[PDB]
Amino acid sequence: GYLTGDMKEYRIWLKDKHLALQFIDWVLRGTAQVMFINNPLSGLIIFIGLLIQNPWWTITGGLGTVVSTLTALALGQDRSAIASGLHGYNGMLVGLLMAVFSEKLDYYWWLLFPVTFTAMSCPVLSSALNSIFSKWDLPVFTLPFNIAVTLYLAATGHYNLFFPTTLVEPVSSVPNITWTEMEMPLLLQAIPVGVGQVYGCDNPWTGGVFLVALFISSPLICLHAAIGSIVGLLAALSVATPFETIYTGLWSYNCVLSCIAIGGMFYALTWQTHLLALICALFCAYMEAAISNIMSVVGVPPGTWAFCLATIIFLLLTTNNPAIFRLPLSKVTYPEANRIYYLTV
Amino acid sequence: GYLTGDMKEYRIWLKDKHLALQFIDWVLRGTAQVMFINNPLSGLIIFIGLLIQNPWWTITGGLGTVVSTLTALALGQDRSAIASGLHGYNGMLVGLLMAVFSEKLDYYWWLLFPVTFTAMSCPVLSSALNSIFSKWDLPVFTLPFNIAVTLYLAATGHYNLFFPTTLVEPVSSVPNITWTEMEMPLLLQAIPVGVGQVYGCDNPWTGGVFLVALFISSPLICLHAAIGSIVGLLAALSVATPFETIYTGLWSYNCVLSCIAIGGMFYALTWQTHLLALICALFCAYMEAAISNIMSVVGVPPGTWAFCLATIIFLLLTTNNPAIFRLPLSKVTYPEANRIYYLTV
Amino acid sequence: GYLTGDMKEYRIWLKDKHLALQFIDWVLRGTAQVMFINNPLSGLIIFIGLLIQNPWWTITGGLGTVVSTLTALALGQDRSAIASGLHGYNGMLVGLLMAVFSEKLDYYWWLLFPVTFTAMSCPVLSSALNSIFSKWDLPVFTLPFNIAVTLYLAATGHYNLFFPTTLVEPVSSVPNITWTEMEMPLLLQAIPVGVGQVYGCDNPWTGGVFLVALFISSPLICLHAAIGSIVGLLAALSVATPFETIYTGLWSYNCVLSCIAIGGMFYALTWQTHLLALICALFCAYMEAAISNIMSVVGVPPGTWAFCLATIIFLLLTTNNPAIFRLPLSKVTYPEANRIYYLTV
């Protein structure tokens, strides 16, 4: 009861504790907000999952979250936004994905020097983007992280002496796909892996832990994450993706985020909105294939550009349907509360 | 008399017929609206020209138009916009150009599965873009088609197993141009071919049929299309393009669209506006060369990005000249009526 | 006294002289406005520095400035903006950098044909961009020049028969950096060279002359230019750039412009704003590395994209700090006057 939703009672009870405890809560909420979850217990569970995946990635992501939150505080950003973790998840992703795409080994402590720096740009970028997107009542989903990490990975590249990144290359030959070597266990495993890849994690246990963290806050978010992962796998099979690429969940995490966002988070959860979420996730999968192919030419990973663009497109979509209701950004908490608010409206 | 303009009398007489006839009219108007023509007879003539070029391309383009119109209806878009074909031409182009840039043979029926899908995204995109561009009173020229087809051709690419696209590669050597092998007949033929390449068609007869379709609705549109084709050829000669590339009309169709749009369609046709149309077409030709070179690196055709960007730039241009008059978007029908409205104003 | 600032007394005394003298003043002010200086004496000193660097580049840049100013006059742009040189510096940069990146020899007079043309697009672009950026009270820093020159250099490319550009290629191997061959004299020389590279000039004397021109108008602008150059060099050393690349000042000029803009020009000069300028210059250096690496894939020089993007981001940044004050665009003259205005406010 006190653990589900966004833990409003815990927020009230902590708004008068020590500043260190409040900062820890903001960091946990920022960790959870990567998947639109404003829950500190979910953030703790996600931290446990990341520790299961890679403790070094956990260190880099936690440092990114801390630095992003501290920079948002120093820049005088909205304290309500900071307290809900809306200024820590972009830095979390920045740290995690500069650890993931580093050609150096684990515990390359020098990588903390760039991480911090490009975690400091995440609040700035957010602010700048909020100067534009607020004029359309749009969120800045992961555009700060995407901009920052794309710029970092292009600036360093694979041949940097200090911070070399992993080699990303375009596809140059037709894959050999024989449909009799499909492994149903691996295809099923790609659903939790697809969920976990929103944090850059390929461990199936990490993805299952992330699903548990999603369910703790909002069961509808967990359901839409699983459905988005499945939609991503189906799209990958539809355009004849090699099975090895499908198994890694790199075709699903953008669709996971898109299905979470459109299906109940920023639209009111109705069956029309659920169908819109499915269509947005499919279009996001194909746009992710396109963006990955385009950005592999300059040697940069696709990130979550496709999720941001597809979700922005489907939020800017205007229909005369009363059942497709876009909630005001200030009223958006989580799909159950969003549906209740929509019913009252 | 009843066949010229936008056939307002026919629209009035059909607004009370069967829904199937109205849908056929909307599809024909969407076919014609690729070249800013809101005329069903012009759409029928364009369909005849496409049948002359390639019946398979006709099938794919017609399916794209039908799917785009049906998706716009299902999404509750403005019925006035749907009835004028403003939600069918982007899907028409999507179907036509995914047929054109398919490495498979003609009548590869499986290509209808992707076509439909990315024809369904054309209304959505339009809506999303209209949420922004309406704040500047701008049209969404072919940005839905350009976004959708660029994403599709990047997602599949040349090495896709199911839907391989044609190989697009950057230029890697200096062309050998000897100016004594210029063929004046082929240079002249490149004018109707340049007009026809707005639909992806390289048949000169198809381009002539398209010019007839333009003339049926508005002689000024036909004149500006021919002048834009000539301007594109002159620009191609100006930057020393190989004659083989010039003959294909790939340097002219963007300029055709830009000259139509700026010269009388969205500006009031005056001599100052005609000069502005010429300058916009020239800048569009050079921007098209730039965009084609840039996008060949990722293996994607240039599309009509240059026309959209150049026309948006020249519409956003603000001058103190009273003779350069930008008509309100709701008053834009065709250059003759636009000039009459401007004279009354 | 009459030579510092923006020479308001000279502007008043010249507003009633011959039109040729006024046009010469506008051209000189446009030359100076590349570095945010609205001073004709500074423009003359910059012209002297360019003559020191390369008289052919001086010819191309002067022609670009003249053509841009004349096109702005013909298009009926704001006479106050034209008289302050705000419509001549983009054309100046266009001419200078199409001369710099030309694979032909000096005094290739045919290069004046493209220069003029893409100097005519600089006002248009500015106008178009001002239709958007004015809605956020933002300047169009060098986006007209960046768009125009990127399009030109992509359209022609290295293999053009008439106007071949220099070969720009991505890095394909790890540099061999031995830190014992650092030359302190060359590292120090890279500061004035970094300042001079805003005009594409690598002569250290040209950069020193540019610093003198900056100091004549505003000592704070000169100080921030030097500090931005130093910040660019420090960033280049931070990401292990080969010393040969560092010595050319190609890592500093974007940071020079960013430090000038944020540190006193469009923000009120306080110590908080000076720190913000340092951070913006650092982020601009890294974004410049990223953009250069990305655009070398399509064979295009980075230009000043990074400066424009970083400065726009840091201007759109919203803080609750009263000491970080964004001046209204109409009140922006130069850092000393800006600080006085901020103190009165």
Side-chain angles (χ1 to χ4, degrees):
Chain A
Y2 293 135
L3 317 162
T4 80
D6 40 336
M7 281 174 132
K8 40 158 199 293
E9 308 93 330
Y10 180 70
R11 200 198 339 243
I12 271 168
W13 177 96
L14 205 81
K15 195 108 64 202
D16 46 56
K17 295 294 136 303
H18 200 281
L19 254 287
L21 293 165
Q22 304 198 32
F23 186 78
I24 290 166
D25 188 68
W26 306 341
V27 161
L28 293 178
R29 293 182 122 106
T31 308
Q33 280 264 19
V34 172
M35 290 180 300
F36 301 104
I37 301 278
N38 186 7
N39 194 295
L41 184 65
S42 287
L44 184 70
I45 300 180
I46 285 152
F47 255 117
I48 286 164
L50 293 150
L51 282 166
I52 286 162
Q53 167 75 44
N54 203 345
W56 167 238
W57 294 0
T58 318
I59 285 162
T60 43
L63 178 59
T65 321
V66 168
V67 164
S68 295
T69 315
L70 282 175
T71 311
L73 284 156
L75 287 178
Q77 305 299 299
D78 180 38
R79 183 61 73 90
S80 171
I82 294 167
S84 63
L86 284 174
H87 279 106
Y89 69 99
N90 276 306
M92 179 81 177
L93 288 174
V94 153
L96 268 169
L97 280 316
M98 317 172 28
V100 165
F101 292 107
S102 186
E103 211 215 17
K104 293 290 203 223
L105 292 179
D106 287 343
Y107 307 104
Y108 183 58
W109 301 109
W110 301 106
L111 194 69
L112 298 189
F113 270 115
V115 161
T116 304
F117 282 16
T118 189
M120 294 192 347
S121 76
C122 282
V124 184
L125 282 160
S126 308
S127 209
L129 286 161
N130 265 311
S131 289
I132 303 150
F133 282 28
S134 70
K135 283 196 64 221
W136 282 272
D137 201 42
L138 286 168
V140 293
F141 285 113
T142 59
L143 284 177
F145 146 75
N146 277 307
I147 291 157
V149 175
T150 297
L151 292 179
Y152 169 79
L153 297 170
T156 44
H158 180 48
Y159 307 107
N160 200 263
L161 198 76
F162 287 169
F163 316 107
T165 79
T166 60
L167 190 48
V168 179
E169 274 182 320
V171 162
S172 45
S173 78
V174 188
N176 167 222
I177 303 192
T178 189
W179 294 85
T180 78
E181 293 177 350
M182 230 201 294
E183 312 280 352
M184 209 46 51
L186 292 190
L187 209 53
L188 289 192
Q189 260 187 49
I191 297 154
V193 172
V195 174
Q197 281 276 7
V198 310
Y199 289 90
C201 312
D202 66 80
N203 206 302
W205 293 106
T206 296
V209 164
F210 288 172
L211 285 163
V212 168
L214 294 174
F215 187 85
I216 291 306
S217 168
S218 170
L220 290 170
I221 294 169
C222 183
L223 177 94
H224 279 86
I227 293 183
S229 208
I230 295 161
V231 160
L233 304 156
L234 294 178
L237 290 160
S238 81
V239 285
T241 306
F243 296 149
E244 232 56 56
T245 311
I246 304 188
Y247 298 156
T248 62
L250 288 171
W251 261 80
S252 319
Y253 66 101
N254 270 266
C255 327
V256 166
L257 290 176
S258 275
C259 215
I260 291 171
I262 299 295
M265 252 315 276
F266 299 94
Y267 276 103
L269 183 55
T270 63
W271 75 260
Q272 288 105 329
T273 299
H274 182 73
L275 286 203
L276 204 76
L278 296 184
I279 283 134
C280 183
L282 201 54
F283 279 157
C284 183
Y286 294 127
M287 173 159 12
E288 161 66 12
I291 282 166
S292 148
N293 277 339
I294 288 166
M295 276 163 81
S296 67
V297 180
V298 298
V300 186
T304 42
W305 282 106
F307 144 70
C308 296
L309 301 182
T311 312
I312 281 155
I313 284 161
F314 270 78
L315 282 177
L316 288 179
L317 160 76
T318 45
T319 73
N320 63 5
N321 210 297
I324 300 160
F325 176 67
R326 214 182 129 201
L327 311 112
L329 252 195
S330 64
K331 315 262 145 280
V332 164
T333 39
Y334 52 97
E336 283 91 357
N338 294 348
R339 207 185 128 71
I340 279 159
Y341 166 81
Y342 157 76
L343 290 179
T344 66
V345 153
Chain B
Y2 293 135
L3 317 162
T4 80
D6 40 336
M7 281 174 132
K8 40 158 199 293
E9 308 93 330
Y10 180 69
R11 200 198 339 243
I12 271 168
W13 177 96
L14 205 81
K15 195 108 65 202
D16 46 56
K17 295 294 136 303
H18 200 281
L19 254 287
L21 293 165
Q22 304 198 32
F23 186 78
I24 290 167
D25 188 68
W26 306 341
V27 161
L28 293 178
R29 293 182 122 106
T31 308
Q33 280 264 19
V34 172
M35 290 180 300
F36 301 104
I37 301 278
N38 186 7
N39 194 295
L41 184 65
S42 287
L44 184 70
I45 300 180
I46 285 152
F47 255 117
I48 286 164
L50 293 150
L51 282 166
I52 286 162
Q53 167 75 44
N54 203 345
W56 167 238
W57 294 0
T58 318
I59 285 162
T60 43
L63 178 59
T65 321
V66 168
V67 164
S68 295
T69 315
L70 282 175
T71 311
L73 284 156
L75 287 178
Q77 305 299 299
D78 181 38
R79 183 61 73 90
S80 171
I82 294 167
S84 63
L86 284 174
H87 279 106
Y89 69 99
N90 276 306
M92 179 81 177
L93 288 174
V94 153
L96 268 169
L97 280 316
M98 317 172 28
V100 165
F101 292 107
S102 186
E103 211 215 17
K104 293 290 203 223
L105 292 179
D106 287 343
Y107 307 104
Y108 183 58
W109 301 109
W110 301 106
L111 194 70
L112 298 189
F113 270 115
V115 161
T116 304
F117 282 16
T118 189
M120 294 192 347
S121 76
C122 282
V124 184
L125 282 160
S126 307
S127 209
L129 286 161
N130 265 311
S131 289
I132 303 150
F133 282 28
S134 70
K135 283 196 64 221
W136 282 272
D137 201 42
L138 286 168
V140 293
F141 285 113
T142 59
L143 284 177
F145 146 75
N146 276 307
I147 291 157
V149 175
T150 297
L151 292 179
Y152 169 79
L153 298 170
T156 44
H158 180 48
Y159 307 107
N160 200 263
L161 198 76
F162 287 169
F163 316 107
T165 79
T166 60
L167 190 48
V168 179
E169 274 182 320
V171 162
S172 45
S173 78
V174 188
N176 167 222
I177 303 192
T178 189
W179 293 85
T180 78
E181 293 177 350
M182 230 201 294
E183 312 280 352
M184 209 45 51
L186 292 190
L187 209 52
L188 289 192
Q189 260 187 49
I191 297 154
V193 172
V195 174
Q197 281 276 7
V198 311
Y199 289 90
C201 312
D202 66 80
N203 206 302
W205 293 106
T206 296
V209 164
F210 289 172
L211 285 163
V212 169
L214 294 173
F215 187 85
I216 291 306
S217 168
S218 170
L220 290 170
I221 294 169
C222 183
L223 177 94
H224 279 86
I227 293 183
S229 208
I230 295 161
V231 160
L233 304 156
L234 294 178
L237 290 160
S238 81
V239 285
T241 306
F243 296 149
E244 232 56 56
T245 311
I246 304 188
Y247 298 156
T248 62
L250 288 172
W251 261 80
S252 319
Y253 66 101
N254 270 266
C255 327
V256 166
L257 291 176
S258 276
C259 215
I260 291 171
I262 299 295
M265 252 315 276
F266 299 94
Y267 276 103
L269 183 55
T270 63
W271 75 260
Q272 288 105 329
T273 299
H274 182 73
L275 286 203
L276 204 76
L278 296 184
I279 283 134
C280 183
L282 201 54
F283 279 157
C284 183
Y286 294 127
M287 173 159 12
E288 161 66 12
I291 282 166
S292 148
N293 277 338
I294 288 165
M295 276 163 81
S296 67
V297 180
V298 298
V300 186
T304 42
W305 282 106
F307 144 70
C308 296
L309 301 182
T311 312
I312 281 155
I313 284 161
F314 270 79
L315 282 177
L316 288 179
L317 160 76
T318 45
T319 73
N320 63 5
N321 210 297
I324 300 160
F325 176 67
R326 214 182 129 201
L327 311 112
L329 251 195
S330 64
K331 315 262 144 280
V332 164
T333 39
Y334 52 97
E336 282 91 357
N338 295 347
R339 207 185 128 71
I340 279 159
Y341 166 81
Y342 157 76
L343 290 179
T344 65
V345 154
Chain C
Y2 293 135
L3 317 162
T4 80
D6 40 336
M7 281 174 132
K8 40 158 199 293
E9 308 93 330
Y10 180 70
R11 200 198 339 243
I12 271 168
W13 177 97
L14 205 81
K15 195 108 65 202
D16 46 56
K17 295 294 136 303
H18 200 281
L19 254 287
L21 293 165
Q22 304 198 32
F23 186 78
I24 290 167
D25 188 68
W26 306 341
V27 161
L28 293 178
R29 293 182 122 106
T31 308
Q33 280 264 19
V34 172
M35 290 180 300
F36 301 104
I37 301 278
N38 186 7
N39 194 294
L41 184 65
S42 287
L44 184 70
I45 300 180
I46 285 152
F47 255 117
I48 286 164
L50 293 150
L51 282 166
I52 286 162
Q53 167 75 44
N54 203 345
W56 167 238
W57 294 0
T58 318
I59 285 162
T60 43
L63 178 59
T65 321
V66 168
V67 164
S68 295
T69 315
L70 282 175
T71 311
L73 284 156
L75 287 178
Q77 305 299 299
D78 181 38
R79 183 61 73 90
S80 171
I82 294 167
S84 63
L86 284 174
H87 279 106
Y89 69 99
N90 276 305
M92 179 81 177
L93 288 174
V94 153
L96 268 169
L97 280 316
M98 317 172 28
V100 165
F101 292 107
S102 186
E103 211 215 17
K104 293 290 203 223
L105 292 179
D106 287 343
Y107 307 104
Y108 183 58
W109 301 109
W110 301 106
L111 194 69
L112 298 188
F113 270 115
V115 161
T116 303
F117 282 16
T118 189
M120 294 192 347
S121 76
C122 282
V124 184
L125 282 160
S126 307
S127 209
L129 286 161
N130 265 311
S131 289
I132 303 150
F133 282 28
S134 70
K135 283 196 64 221
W136 282 272
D137 201 42
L138 286 168
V140 293
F141 285 113
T142 59
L143 284 177
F145 146 75
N146 277 307
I147 291 157
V149 175
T150 297
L151 292 179
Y152 169 79
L153 298 170
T156 44
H158 180 48
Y159 307 107
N160 200 263
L161 198 76
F162 287 169
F163 316 107
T165 79
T166 60
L167 190 48
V168 179
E169 274 182 320
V171 162
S172 45
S173 78
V174 188
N176 167 222
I177 303 192
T178 189
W179 294 85
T180 78
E181 293 177 350
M182 230 201 293
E183 312 280 352
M184 209 46 51
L186 292 190
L187 209 52
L188 289 192
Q189 260 187 49
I191 297 155
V193 172
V195 174
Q197 281 276 7
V198 311
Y199 289 90
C201 312
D202 66 80
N203 206 302
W205 293 106
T206 296
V209 164
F210 289 172
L211 285 163
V212 168
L214 294 174
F215 187 85
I216 291 306
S217 168
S218 170
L220 290 170
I221 294 169
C222 183
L223 177 94
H224 279 86
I227 293 183
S229 208
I230 295 161
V231 160
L233 304 156
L234 294 178
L237 290 160
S238 81
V239 285
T241 306
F243 296 149
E244 232 56 56
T245 311
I246 304 188
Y247 298 156
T248 62
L250 288 172
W251 261 80
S252 319
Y253 66 101
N254 270 266
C255 327
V256 166
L257 291 176
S258 276
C259 215
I260 291 171
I262 299 295
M265 252 315 276
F266 299 94
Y267 276 103
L269 183 55
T270 63
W271 75 260
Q272 288 105 329
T273 299
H274 182 73
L275 286 203
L276 204 76
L278 296 184
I279 283 134
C280 183
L282 201 54
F283 279 157
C284 183
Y286 294 127
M287 173 159 12
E288 161 66 12
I291 282 166
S292 148
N293 277 339
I294 287 166
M295 276 163 81
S296 67
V297 180
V298 298
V300 186
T304 42
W305 282 106
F307 144 70
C308 296
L309 301 182
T311 312
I312 281 155
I313 284 161
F314 270 79
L315 282 177
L316 288 179
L317 160 76
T318 45
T319 73
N320 63 5
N321 210 297
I324 300 160
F325 176 67
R326 214 182 129 201
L327 311 112
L329 252 195
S330 64
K331 315 262 145 280
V332 164
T333 39
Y334 52 97
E336 283 91 357
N338 295 348
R339 207 185 128 71
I340 279 159
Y341 166 81
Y342 157 76
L343 290 179
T344 65
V345 153

